[PDB]
Amino acid sequence: DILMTQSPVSMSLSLGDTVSITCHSSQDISSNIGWLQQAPGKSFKGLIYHGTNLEDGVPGRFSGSGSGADYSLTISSLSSEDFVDYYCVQYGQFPWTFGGGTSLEIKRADAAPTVSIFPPSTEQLTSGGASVVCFLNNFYPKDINVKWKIDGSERQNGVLNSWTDQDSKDSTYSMSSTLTLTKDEYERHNSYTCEATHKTSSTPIVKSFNRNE
Amino acid sequence: CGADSYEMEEDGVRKC
Amino acid sequence: DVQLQESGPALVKPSQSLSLTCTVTGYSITSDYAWNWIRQFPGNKLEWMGYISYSANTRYNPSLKSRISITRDTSKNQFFLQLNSVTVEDTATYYCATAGRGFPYWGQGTLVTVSAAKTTAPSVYPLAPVSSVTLGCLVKGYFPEPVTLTWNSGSLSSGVHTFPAVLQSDLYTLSSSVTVTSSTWPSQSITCNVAHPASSTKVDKKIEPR
């Protein structure tokens, strides 16, 4: 099969910047390549076919170049809507194959997370389990860490973490962290603490609650 | 399609 | 406009068959083009499965040849994917697409999980605190994906973050936060609306102060 090697895997850029995404094929494909655009969590739009031809209603800032085994998608003067995912596809040989994708993210000023902590609901407690939830919302840049303490003691296991794609309105990220214990273990301890570590401060943002309160 | 090629159609798919 | 929409099961057991329908509107599948199935794996890698052409010729990825069939119904303007003997390796988001000059038309995609795990209805828990106030909903203990979650029946969409679901021990957890200006809630109610189609579940959880 033809291997499509697509670069870079991700890029962080500013509005008005120019970027090239490249695809290399493991065999000559004679310009039988398309470029696809994907909003994360959604589906695809055809941008270019036969290496260089714009689809209907694709702006002149998108261009394609290349021949043989090496091709590039260039976006000159990036706009806000352009910071999404891109994939190349070869249809020169069966089976048709895809590049591994490129994620484009927009640069933005630093923002500290807004941290919120939540005790288990009485409803959950009837089931014999207890979850403590922490949201770290609307931060930039993407790199963050979360840490749980139970009566002061770090707890790694039994936690589930999830994060969002870059926000389409303020270009931030968000994270949810859920610590789950048995009701018995939950009722053996007093304080529950979420700590967010982020470049925006040398000290953690700490949110806590006490059961005795 | 490159100067060595022309666009053809196979199964409804255009290809160089 | 040409429009494509996938439909089919969200869950298939290992060794059973995965079968999807693509319904096409605004263009006839007998007029031109090839009518494809593509899937995107967890991790975002894309694979071409095969196509049926406007003239009914099929072409398949060799990796799937023993297990795949693509068919159509010209009276309904629909084409179909059948994938047999599935394994957990077949868990992916499935797309139908048109190939003509590149790939101009795509369905929305549909998640199919392959697993022997039991369909389980979610528990929906309120998240209420012990300038602005944050509330949330915790949807725990369900299988398979997807769930849909809204606040105030879709009327409250700004300041909402709904996080990707996490699988642990064959059950999912999903959470959503919503941030509003202080002293709105609780006089103005905040309710999370949760649907889990696979267990025919629908729950509205009104967030009460603690």
C53, C43 in Cβ contact below 8 A? no
Residue C154 phi, psi dihedral angles, 5° rounding? 95, -10
Residue count of chain C: 210
What is d(CA A134, CA A179) in angstroms, rounded to the nearest whole number? 8
Query: Is A49 in a helix, a strand, or coil?
Result: strand
Residues 6 or more apart whose Cβ sits within 8 Å of residue C165? A162, C139, C145, C146, C147, C172, C173, C174
CA C59 to chain B, closest CA, distance in angstroms equals 10
Method: X-ray
SS3 content of chain B, % helix, strand, coil (to 5): 0, 40, 60
Residue A58 DSSP SS3: coil
C38 vs C60: CA distance, rounded Å: 11
Q: Which residues contact C14 (CB under 8 A, 6 or more apart)?
A: C86, C87, C88, C114, C115, C116
3-state secondary structure of A140: strand
Q: Parallel, antiparallel, or unpaired for β A153-155 and A53-54?
A: unpaired
Q: What is the 3-state secondary structure (H, E, C) of chain C?
A: CCEEEEECCCEECCCCCEEEEEEEECCCCCCCCEEEEEEECCCCCEEEEEEEECCCCEEECHHHCCCEEEEEECCCCEEEEEECCCCHHHCEEEEEEEEECEEEEECCCEEEEECCCCCECCEEEEECCCCEEEEEEEEEEEECCCCEEEEHHHCECCCEEECCCEEECCEEEEEEEEEEECCCCCCCCCEEEEEEHHHCEEEEEECCCC
Asked if the C-beta of B3 comes within 8 angstroms of chain A's C-beta atoms, the answer is no
Give C98→chain B minimum CA distance, Å: 9
Shortest CA distance from A52: residue in chain B: B1
Nearest to A30 among B13, B14, B16 (CB): B16
Find tokens 């806590």 and name the residue.
Answer: A208
Query: Strand pairing partners for A110?
Result: none
How close, in Å, is residue B15 to chain A by CA atoms?
A: 6
Chain C: nearest CA to B13, how far in angstroms?
4
Pairwise CB contact (< 8 Å): A162 & C175? yes
Number of H helices, E strands in chain B: 0, 2
Question: Which domains does chain A show, CATH number per domain?
Answer: 1-107 (2.60.40.10), 108-211 (2.60.40.10)
The chains found to touch C (3+ Cβ pairs under 8 angstroms) are: A, B
What's the rounded Cα separation, in Å, for the pair C40 and A124?
Answer: 35
Neighbours of C76 (CB within 10 A): 11
Residue B1, H or E segment: none
Helix (H, G, I), strand (E, B), or coil: what is residue A5?
A: strand
| CB–CB contact A31 B2 (8 Å) | yes
- Contact, A4 vs A88, CB < 8 A? yes
Question: To which H or E segment does residue A183 belong?
Answer: helix A183-186
- Report H helices in A20-98: none
Q: For chain A, say whether B7 makes contact (Cβ under 8 Å).
A: yes
Strand residue runs (E) in chain A: 4-7, 10-13, 19-25, 33-38, 44-49, 53-54, 62-67, 70-75, 85-90, 97-98, 102-106, 114-118, 129-139, 144-150, 153-155, 159-163, 173-182, 191-198, 205-210
Q: Which chains touch B (3 or more CB pairs under 8 A)?
A: A, C
Which residues in chain B have Cβ-Cβ distances shorter than 8 Å to C51? 11
Peptide bond into A119 cis (omega under 30): no
A neighbours by CB contacts (3+ pairs under 8 Å): B, C
Does domain C1-116 fall into CATH 3.90.550.10? no
Q: Which helix (H) or strand (E) holds A57?
A: none
A193: chain C residues, CB-CB within 8 Å: none
**For chain C, what are the domain ranges?**
1-116, 117-209
Token couple for A202: 């040398």
CATH 2.60.40.10 fits C117-209, yes or no: yes
Of C117, C173, C120, nearest to C149 (Cα)? C173
Contact C121, C105 (CB under 8 A): no
| Number of inter-chain CB pairs under 8 A, A vs B | 21
- Nearest Cα residue to C135 out of C117, C169, C161: C161
Q: How many of the other CB atoms lie within 10 Å of CB of A153? A: 10
User: Does A31 lie at the interface with B, CB-CB under 8 angstroms?
Assistant: yes
Q: Is the minimum CB–CB distance between C54 and chain B shorter than 8 Å?
A: yes
Work out the minimum CA distance from A35 to partner chain B, whole angstroms.
15
The two tokens of residue A160 are 């589930």
Do A84 and A101 form a contact (C-beta atoms < 8 A)? no
